[PDB]
Amino acid sequence: MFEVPITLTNRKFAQRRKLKYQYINYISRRFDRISKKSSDEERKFWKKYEKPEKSFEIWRTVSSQNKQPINKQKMTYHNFKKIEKIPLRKMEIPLLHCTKENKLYFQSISRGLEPLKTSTSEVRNYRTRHIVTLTDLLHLNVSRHNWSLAYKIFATLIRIPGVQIKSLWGIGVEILDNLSNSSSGLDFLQWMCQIYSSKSRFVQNINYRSIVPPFQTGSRTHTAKFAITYLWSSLINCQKSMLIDKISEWVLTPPFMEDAEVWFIYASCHLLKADTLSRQFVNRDIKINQVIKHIHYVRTFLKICLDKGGFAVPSRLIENQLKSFESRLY
Amino acid sequence: LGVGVQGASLYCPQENYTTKKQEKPQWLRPVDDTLAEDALDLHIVVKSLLCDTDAFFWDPTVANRLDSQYIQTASDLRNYRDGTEIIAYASGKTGSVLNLTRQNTLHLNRHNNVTSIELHSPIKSIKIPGASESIGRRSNLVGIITENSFQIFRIESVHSRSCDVMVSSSEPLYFVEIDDLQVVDFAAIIDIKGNWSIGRIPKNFNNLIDNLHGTIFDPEELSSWKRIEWFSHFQKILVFDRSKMIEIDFMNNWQTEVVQAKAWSNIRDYKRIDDKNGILLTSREIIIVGASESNDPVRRISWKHDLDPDDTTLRITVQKVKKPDHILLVAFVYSMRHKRIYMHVFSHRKANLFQSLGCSTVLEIPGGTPTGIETILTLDFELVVDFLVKLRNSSEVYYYALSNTVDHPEWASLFNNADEREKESIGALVSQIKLKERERISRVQNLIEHENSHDEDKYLQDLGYRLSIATNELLESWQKTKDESIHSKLKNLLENSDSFASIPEFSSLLDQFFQYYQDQDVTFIGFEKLLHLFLHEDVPGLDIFYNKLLQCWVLVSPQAELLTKEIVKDIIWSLARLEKPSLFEPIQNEISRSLSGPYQDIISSWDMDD
Amino acid sequence: TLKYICAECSSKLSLSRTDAVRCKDCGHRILLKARTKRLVQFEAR
Amino acid sequence: VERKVYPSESRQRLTSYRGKLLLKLKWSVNNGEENLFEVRDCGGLPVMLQSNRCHLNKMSPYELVQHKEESDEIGGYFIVNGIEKLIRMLIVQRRNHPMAIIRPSFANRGASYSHYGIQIRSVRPDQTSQTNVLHYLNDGQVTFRFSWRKNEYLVPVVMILKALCHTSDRE
Amino acid sequence: FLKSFQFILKRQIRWLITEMRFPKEFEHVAKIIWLKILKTINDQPQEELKLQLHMTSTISILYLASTHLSLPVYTCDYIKWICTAKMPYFQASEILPKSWRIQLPNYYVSILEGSISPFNGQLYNKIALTCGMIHFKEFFNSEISCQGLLLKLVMQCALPPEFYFYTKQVIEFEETDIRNLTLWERTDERHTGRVSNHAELRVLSYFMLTINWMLSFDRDRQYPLKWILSLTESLTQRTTTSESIGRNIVKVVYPDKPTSSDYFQWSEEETLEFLKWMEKQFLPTDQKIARRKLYKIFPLDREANHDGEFNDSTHQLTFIEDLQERYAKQTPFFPPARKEAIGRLLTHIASQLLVDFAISKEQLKDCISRIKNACLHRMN
DNA sequence: TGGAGTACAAGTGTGAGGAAAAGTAGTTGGGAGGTACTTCAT
DNA sequence: ATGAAGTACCTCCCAACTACTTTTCCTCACACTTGTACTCCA
């Protein structure tokens, strides 16, 4: 049922994906001239669209300048049988080079009729066949509130040659929820951000197989999902263990000039630091002008949080968090 | 209102963490973590039965062939009696027809009177949308889609004395445009393969499409999944495929691609929650609960959770559970390839502040996979939910209530022919072992009458002497046929070899006969180091081989004894391969085959290296 | 058995041909040569 | 794995103690209707020891011992290809104050130049200098000297003064 | 290729002599069978000879040595000792050669390691080829020890031992030259015979038709319908022996048939011993400091208070005693609804038998068609 | 009991379909300073 | 129609990542025809 961390590669899948986007290309250019009047064949295909690389889907805000009128020029049955016959007249001649089950596959998928067989379900590699066995028991026992057994599965899963970053960090909630012989859950996300710190530009031309951005890689203009999970973790872990200046230095050293969630967590570090020192044990020379810096960083990091892209802070309430904090100072 | 958004997207994935905090220093868990705390939540079924009646692919256009929702006809509007739940499913030879109250369990009405209206096309899509909660009423009309037409019915004036559901109809609008249409919604609004249209519904059933329309035709979308839903009753619709979501205001000229899902995911399912703001979307790889904007009701992209499975045939049902402080939403995704369900718990609160809890999964009955799962509204921390399933390639609809606290025809059709001539012919060979085992329950019982007899000790002495002369006849026939360079029976005797029932004393025949050959020309295999292949454990003795088998069939057989004697006897006279020749024979043969191969295969014929 | 020393983690470490000149526990490159048992002599002056 | 290089490592290697220089651009076309922002790797510039950008900054004499330094490591120098080098301080004219110099090599510059003159060294808030000499000719003419690229340009003073603000000739 | 393939064959035999205790004559029997197929490679035209070897064939000439010594091992106990990775079949190239690995071509070593399991009767067809390649007939004594196969299939499903003799009377009916269920030879074509010519396979449909006809035409009313439902659910029941948990491993490997994603219905303890089996999968199967550090944060052991020394006397019981639970479960011994319960057992006895012998549903369905329709053609 | 069409035992010619590991074709992240070129204005 | 001359923007650099064929394999189905196994019409 669950997703597998396998780079599984077979000619019969590489045929039916090569046969599909080739047919997609001809009907695309054939439609490029009909609306006007009124060398991989897939590396060419993805040069039209934008791979999101932050999200699984490139979402849009709508009540904006993304407006467009209704294209009331519809399609009907006469126009569609004539716009498909010239691809299929040129698509039938590579159909003598493929295997028969793909010529069985390509006809049915051309009229709707989605496939029912999962691509991992006929691999029979005997090593993937235990990876499918182990990940389906892993997500099951994570679901079944059974953490000592899901750890045994997960430790025996990462030791098989071939696994990937899918299972690696996401369901590393096991150490987080074991808490008896724990490796703290934060030694592992520090391990993830030490060896997967990537700064290479997202090239977007190569077909991606088995590695996918929006939850497991970390390129420029996209902080890794485990990186900002490491920062939200080691601030709550810092707070619950009352060390605040260590994370207040480790966030200081990267200037991620792109995303604002790394600036809000920076703004929240000094906010929690100014919260804690604002007790003062009166019932007084430096402890006055020490808090007044950490009020000031929160007001300069929340401002630069807002000049970046979309990260909607409740900036109104944060100013009231601090205006109460100087009253304890006064 | 928490903090960690993108604006255009808003996440809370599979148990890494939240992405937010406010740091509220108020001694009340100073955090607004999007993952609230409570204990576990298990679900146990309460099973029932409600009613009943190429293959490497599946069809996207056929969606639901049953429906069940609380309905409000025209008579219950005027009357103070209000609220009835019906069931409209498909049946027929090819599935071509269209046709109640809960006492303590949900069941079909006592009058068991289905209004089986019949059609001249297979039934594909059966649904009602229902109505809004600020209109004061519930709908009374169902729409269905078939391969010939598109029909709208209306439930009219349910009865209490007879449980009679008489209907009306709208006229079946056929294919004026020759392309198959997919999805109906009311809240005649239809979606054909590529293009959508708006219709005007009549109120007289005793004697059509409106003149405004549009399309979402992408040429490189080879699937046939189209889908339409109004968004918050404001004459704004949402039209779908497996690649993008489009928001269209047909009242203005306004159309916008909101979702675009070509690169790594695809849009699988979309169910409109009866909360007119919050609506749940099922992509692959993620579950999205995309709600509506506070200011202009267009589409807000709200708290979503990473769906761990990956498949092309996933659907979803969602049911609200209205609670005092908050609103819950469970989200059951089901698959046509297996039986496992997969859920989450969201908790909608006042200021569109809503959260996640976790996930859990439960099984089904092992014959078939869900082609339909449908919940029951129930007129409106002990998490309870009920629903009713319908499995693929079976037409029995069951009933389930989750609370907080097989002979296949393929094996049966191969047998049992209706030949009266060959009926007793099979029983005739049965009749052979009706007798012949009763022979051998007494032929061996005779040997049970002689325990350590001198007549059976004479017989082994007759046995081992009949094993002797045939042995020295057999070996000397191998001595003259030795130099061949080009076989072990111990069944040369033929009289009975089985008129001796004493298993340890048979080993005394067996052990002594092996000691008599100390020199060459014969080899013998073992029977203690080699008999462990049956009991799958260490078997040191053949008497305790028998003794753990004798203590294994104590209950099942009448007196159980002479069977256990002569199975073991039948094994040893089958494991009597004890006449392999000695060191002279294969070693002069292994050198003999080594010579016919050249120098090329000499070094390639070499053991004993590591 | 001739060995070396990693300058960082101080682990004693022999090194063969067709090896990356690195420590094998930390990944450190600067890798100083240890001294072995060998006779040198001095005037006590 | 990203590691944290210390200056004792950079002496053993006989390399520089370089820290990476980053620099984000603004490819603005048609006056800001369309912008492109690219943080570009501009090499590693060497870093002064025990400064902000050294790893020995906020660090104890106990930790300087453990990280292979002297316990009173002073810093203030760059490590460039193993050799420790430092930028020598200089003596330059005090900023923002018009000096009253006389100098014999002003009449060696042209005709009727006096030896008299006012010299100001103006610094910008990014510590970049700009020197403006104010000559006196024997005509009674007063000029204004500066150096822009490596050239040396002269202008009359009432061409500056009547370009700085709107001036009545009595003001 | 041959110097290493024989060495993988040598190491497979050297396991069975040590642990499964096949005697030191079994080593010699296989060498002639290896030398007669090594002489077969000689006789071909050596330029583009295109020799036929596969990893299915290292079981065959280990099974050809099994029936000549007339051993009670079967192909159920070859498909099990490879899928539990006991003898070097899967990844047979990963640990064995150590020098020949890199100087061998890529195509010859992917074949040489266990990339797939034999499926849909691929193992028998290689035996049927190899019995034709060398002349196993009339040089060896091809007599399959089918009597323990009936005995083991008694103990497989915990039936009364009358079934042992209800079967063997049927075998003595429908067989030309009553004895000698001979291993089939094929050297003539490339067409696998649609007869189910394999004598070890024909015992199954004999046993499938025996177990039906004694219960369907139950004239004596000896086997009651209370016992039938006390036999199906006694058999359709999950226990945690060493031998059934190894059969859980075999259900994992084969992906087409139903009851292949059966691991969802496992228990707690059936998963722990599977993970205790997993410490016999990893032993067959300069910036390595990342995995050195990740294995330090995920140690393979139980993190504290393990199950080695101070655990118990016995939790996990052997193959003899769960039978004594199944046999002591079926104590009641003293119609359109009867045959529906007959097909409960037939389905569960055959689907058990379908994974244990690596054949498709139609490979066994055809064997019913070539036995039952041959049993009445010979009767009438 | 003799005279012809279809149901199936019983033996046989064509390539096609499917794996994994070496080796390989594009976008990128990693660095050194003069040499070479073909014109054009007087 | 050249003798000189600054600029013709050439070059003069590798490696690493991640994908795509590429190398023969081995496995067989996939199915043909006349007799073998029964029932319609003289």
Swiss-Prot record, chain A:
This is RNA polymerase I-specific transcription initiation factor RRN11. Its main location: nucleus. GO terms for biological process: nucleolar large rRNA transcription by RNA polymerase I. Signal peptide: none annotated. It comes from the Eukaryota. InterPro entries: RNA_pol_I-specific_init_factor, TIF_Rrn11, TIF_Rrn11_budding_yeast. It is found in: Nucleus, Nucleolus. Keywords: Nucleus, Transcription, Transcription regulation. One of its GO terms (cellular component) is nucleus. Acts as a component of the core factor (CF) complex which is essential for the initiation of rDNA transcription by RNA polymerase I. After binding of UAF (upstream activation factor) to an upstream element of the promoter, CF is recruited in a SPT15/TBP-dependent manner to form a preinitiation complex. Component of the core factor (CF) complex, which consists of RRN6, RRN7 and RRN11. The CF heterotrimer may further dimerize to form a hexamer. RRN11 interacts with RRN6, RRN7 and SPT15. One of its GO terms (molecular function) is RNA polymerase I general transcription initiation factor activity. The gene is RRN11. Present with 476 molecules/cell in log phase SD medium.
From Swiss-Prot, chain B:
One of its GO terms (cellular component) is cytoplasm. It is found in: Cytoplasm; Nucleus, Nucleolus. One of its GO terms (biological process) is transcription initiation at RNA polymerase I promoter. InterPro entries: RNA_pol_I-sp_TIF_RRN6-like, Rrn6, RRN6_beta-prop, RRN6_HB, Rrn6_K-rich. The keyword Transcription regulation applies. It holds the Pfam family Rrn6_HB. Its main location: cytoplasm. One of its GO terms (molecular function) is RNA polymerase I transcription regulatory region sequence-specific DNA binding. Keywords: Cytoplasm, Nucleus, Transcription, Transcription regulation. It comes from the Eukaryota. Present with 237 molecules/cell in log phase SD medium. Acts as a component of the core factor (CF) complex which is essential for the initiation of rDNA transcription by RNA polymerase I. After binding of UAF (upstream activation factor) to an upstream element of the promoter, CF is recruited in a SPT15/TBP-dependent manner to form a preinitiation complex. Component of the core factor (CF) complex, which consists of RRN6, RRN7 and RRN11. The CF heterotrimer may further dimerize to form a hexamer. RRN6 interacts with RRN7, RRN11 and RRN9. This is RNA polymerase I-specific transcription initiation factor RRN6. It comes from Saccharomyces cerevisiae (strain ATCC 204508 / S288c) (Baker's yeast).
From Swiss-Prot, chain C:
Zn(2+) binds at C6, C9, C23, C26. GO terms for cellular component: cytoplasm; nucleolus; nucleoplasm; nucleus; peroxisome; RNA polymerase I complex; RNA polymerase II, core complex; RNA polymerase III complex. The chain holds residues 26 to 70 of 70 of the full protein. This is DNA-directed RNA polymerases I, II, and III subunit RPABC4. DNA-dependent RNA polymerases catalyze the transcription of DNA into RNA using the four ribonucleoside triphosphates as substrates. Common component of RNA polymerases I, II and III which synthesize ribosomal RNA precursors, mRNA precursors and many functional non-coding RNAs, and a small RNAs, such as 5S rRNA and tRNAs, respectively. RNA polymerases are composed of mobile elements that move relative to each other. In Pol II, the core element with the central large cleft comprises RPB3, RBP10, RPB11, RPB12 and regions of RPB1 and RPB2 forming the active center. It comes from the Eukaryota. Present with 907 molecules/cell in log phase SD medium. It is found in: Nucleus, Nucleolus; Peroxisome. GO terms for biological process: nucleolar large rRNA transcription by RNA polymerase I; ribosome biogenesis; RNA-templated transcription; termination of RNA polymerase I transcription; termination of RNA polymerase III transcription; transcription by RNA polymerase I; transcription by RNA polymerase II; transcription by RNA polymerase III. A zinc finger (C4-type) spans 6-26. Its main location: nucleus. One of its GO terms (molecular function) is DNA-directed RNA polymerase activity. The gene is RPC10.
Curated annotation (Swiss-Prot), chain D:
It is found in: Nucleus, Nucleolus. Three distinct zinc-containing RNA polymerases are found in eukaryotic nuclei: polymerase I for the ribosomal RNA precursor, polymerase II for the mRNA precursor, and polymerase III for 5S and tRNA genes. Present with 14100 molecules/cell in log phase SD medium. Component of the RNA polymerase I (Pol I) complex consisting of 14 subunits: RPA135, RPA190, RPC40, RPA14, RPB5, RPO26, RPA43, RPB8, RPA12, RPB10, RPC19, RPC10, RPA49 and RPA34. The complex is composed of a horseshoe-shaped core containing ten subunits (RPA135, RPA190, RPB5, RPO26, RPB8, RPB10, RPC10, RPA12, RPC19 and RPC40) where RPA135 and RPA190 form the DNA-binding cleft. Outside of the core, RPA14 and RPA43 form the stalk that mediates interactions with transcription initiation factors and newly synthesized RNA. Belongs to the RNA polymerase beta chain family. This is DNA-directed RNA polymerase I subunit RPA135. It comes from Saccharomyces cerevisiae (strain ATCC 204508 / S288c). The chain holds residues 117 to 287 of 1203 of the full protein.
